[PDB]
Paper text:
The analysis for the data corresponding to the PCO2 of 90 mmHg was the most interesting. Here, out of the eight given classes, the majority of particles divided into three classes, which, in order of particle number, result in maps with nominal resolutions of 2.0, 2.1, and 2.6 Å. The second class, however, had a much better defined N terminus extending to a solid ring in the center of the funnel. It also had the most distinctively different conformation of the cytoplasmic tips of the transmembrane helices. A comparison of the maps derived from particles in classes 1 and 2, respectively, indicates there is a rotation of the whole cytoplasmic region of the protein relative to the extracellular side, with a flexing of TM2, in particular. This movement appears to be coupled to how well the N termini are defined in the density and has the aspect of an iris-like movement. To understand the conformational variation within the 90 mmHg PCO2 data in more detail, structures were built and refined from the maps associated with the top two classes. Comparing the two resulting structures (denoted hereafter as structure Class 1 [C1] and C2) shows that the cytoplasmic part of TM2 flexes at Pro 87 such that there is an almost rigid body rotation of 14° of the C terminal part of the helix from residues Ala88 to Glu101. In structure C2, where the N terminus is more defined, TM2 is straighter with interactions between Val95 and His16, though the latter is not well defined in the density. Morphing between these structures indicates that as TM2 moves, the N terminus and the following residues, including the first few residues of TM1, also change position.
Author numbering:
A (entry chain J), B (entry chain I), C (entry chain H), D (entry chain G), E (entry chain L), F (entry chain K): 2 to 100, 129 to 217
Write the structure that this text describes.
């Protein structure tokens, strides 16, 4: 929903650098549009259409929870909020400044927190789901499922396409932030 | 939804102290974003996907009600409203003041109510759910369920992750308020 | 939804008295937040999860209608609209005045209608549901149910918590209005 | 949704008469609030929870259509739009006037169309549903239902309460318009 | 949703003629209100409640598709967008003009496209659905349905009422545009 | 939702050329209206109403995923975002310019990226779905479906109508951009 975000993005459109003015902000808007407009309804029936070949009551609940401890959309929602906080803090700091070394140290710290935040979430996506490709079939042997029970995921291919798309864009944002640090580092 | 909250948070952005200007407000916004964007849809199917291994009609309703007297999202919604009231009252009080001891006593009372409100809700979350970890299996023996009936919870792991996240952030907000009282106390 | 309610509450924030400026308005906002944010989704599955132990077609419809002639959320929605009308009328009356006895009589009449409106709805909640506690089991013998049929309510405990919360806040608003009348009565 | 209706109602708040300024506008807002906030979700499951005691395929569709040619909420939605048109036309006519007999004839014609529009819809509600009370049981013998089939309505009591409430308020609006005509008629 | 449409309709409220200022714009708003507020939820369960008397898998999908190649609400949505384009183009053309023969030719062409657009869609509604009345029973013999299968439509009467209402209003808009051409033609 | 898009489209309404001012912007708005108002609810039950003639658990999930790797609405959502980025970048570039060769090279590059972006997505729609016509019947032999299983698509005809409509409009936008390049090329 639009609401009044134009004031926020327009307000933070200033107080930036050569690449922070445009390139780092359009990509952040780019990820929000993908998550809200298209990606949010792909995971709508993640559990409703999760089908297991068994008659054991409660086996469906435990198997979905075992292989999906947290949904992909929830992780992406958390990642965007975390990376948007250092930018927000420095955005209102220059307003107080207009109301240099400490400001320079404040700015160079925000770009350092964004790199590790994106790297951490990108690392979580790999260890938790053993890769960026979602499989059609998952084998589940958790209690109370008898022996091993075959379960099938809903829309595995479409979720894979968005998973690769989100990771690739986040990797690009890391490169821009790294070049931003190098740009300021040489200037001293 | 954005609507016009920017005027509220922007309006209450002033009339604050060294840490109340930024740190105590971003965390309050942080909890709202988590509850609305991500956490609210995790508890969407709390009762729909609640499965019990029985054929007794009405046993599902009583067991879910017994182990979930009030949903976690409802408690968090109540907590945010209560803690936001003392800040709102003092926010409009300084507007009347611009329209010192009594103002100082008014301000130091708001930070005292927020500490006990957050402590009370944090205490309720512990006694009601015997900890911050949600179990996959719950054993239910309430009428009319015959003997003991096994029931299974929906998304126990994902709800645990958000439960720990909300508690940890609320604990941080307590520390900031405590330091705020100590900051004013030494000044006298 | 925010929309433009800030203009309404901000507009009616003026034209008030010592307690009408803040205390009587925050509680009115307090009840709206509880009803919309949390309480509205508790009654979402009031009839969907209503379970009766019978095979008679149509017995479920008649029993739910017999014990729930009108939902609690609908009654609270009606109550808020009725109590907000006398305040709205006097809010736009002073605008015409700025555009004393008659104004004083107009103001003292609004606080009189709000007391009886809240008392009436509070009385309806008692006679209709024989108390503020909702039971897990209801015994139904209306046609076409054969003999007496046991039916089970959805989320009886959680609805009880909000029922007590709404009644208690409404009782507090009665006391404030009563003191408002006494405050003006002594002044003459 | 609020959106920008405050400009519309605030704009049409002027250009009125002694009772058109307040009394005739608050009641019109009153009906909108009832229809949107509370009444619209009562008829949500009108057909989903419509249950017939038969095994004949397609008998449910024909019986619901026979006894409910048009839903109550749809009729109320049509009625509000029709009655709001004469007021809207004269609202923008005085703006052209500021940009007397013809204006007086224009104004007195709007109150004449509103009386017959409300009377017509009130008459339709009576002949179509043979009264303002909804029954729990309806007997249906339309093809392809064999012989007579018993069907049960969803929430008959709650729909009756709102049906009486809407009719009573509409009857009050007729009286105000009638007095408005008499008020101008004596003045000549 | 309101949003900012008041600026659009208010902006295009000017730059019109004797009947284009009011009559042709209120009817266009009239159709939008009917389609959004009331008519859009009537077709909500068009396929969910479509019932066929057969046990053949996939027969329900083919029969609904055969008799409903495109929903009525989708056709009305397309019609409103098409007819609103010539008005929009001339609305921004006069803004460039303020920034006569060509303008006169531009204006008289917009009213010519609106007549044929409404006539075309009105013709499509007739040939596709063989009239403006929807039947309760449809006989389907498409593959893989064996022989002829009886299927039943959801809410046939209510959809008929709105179908006649939309056609009648669109016919009125044709007459206004025709008189607009005749009004300018005699003037030369 | 309107929100504040009028400022965006109104803001980018300037800074354009003879055809970029109106023709290229109304078509872009045209596609958004079709996708949001009408086309988005056609694909609502794409998987819910997907029916296969088999008793093998999990065969429905794999067959829908095999023939629909990504939904048509998701592809259109991606296409609109990509084509809207070059226009957005040059829209804010002229604001910096007002705050010629490089500007001319910047403008002529945006129209070059839009041609290849639309051509690429149009090519994807052809190879992935072997044409712009959707079939009622799909034959599926992927594991674990035994032998070949017949499955039926929901609303194949209505989706075909919108598929042709979206492709045709996108083809028109390519022609306008091509003429835009030729218009500037001759001028040099």
């Amino acid at each position: 929903d639009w609401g009044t975000l134009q004031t926020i993005l327009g307000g933070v459109n200033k107080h930036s650098t050569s690449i922070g003015k445009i390139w780092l902000t359009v990509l952040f808007i780019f990820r929000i549009m993908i998550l809200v407009v298209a990606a949010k309804e792909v995971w709508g029936d993640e559990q409703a259409d999760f089908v297991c070949n068994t008659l054991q009551p409660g086996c469906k609940n435990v198997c979905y929870d075992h292989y999906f401890p947290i949904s992909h959309i929830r992780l992406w929602a958390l990642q965007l909020i975390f990376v948007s906080t250092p930018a927000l803090l420095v955005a209102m700091h220059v307003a107080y400044r207009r109301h240099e070394g400490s400001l320079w140290w404040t700015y160079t710290s925000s770009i350092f927190f964004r790199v590790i935040f994106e790297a951490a979430f990108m690392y979580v996506f790999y260890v938790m789901y053993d890769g960026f490709s979602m499989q059609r079939l998952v084998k589940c042997n958790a209690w109370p499922c008898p022996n091993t029970v075959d379960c099938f995921v809903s829309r595995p291919t479409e979720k894979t396409v968005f998973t690769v798309f989100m990771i690739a864009v986040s990797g690009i944002c890391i490169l821009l932030n790294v070049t931003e640090l190098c740009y300021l580092l040489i200037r001293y």
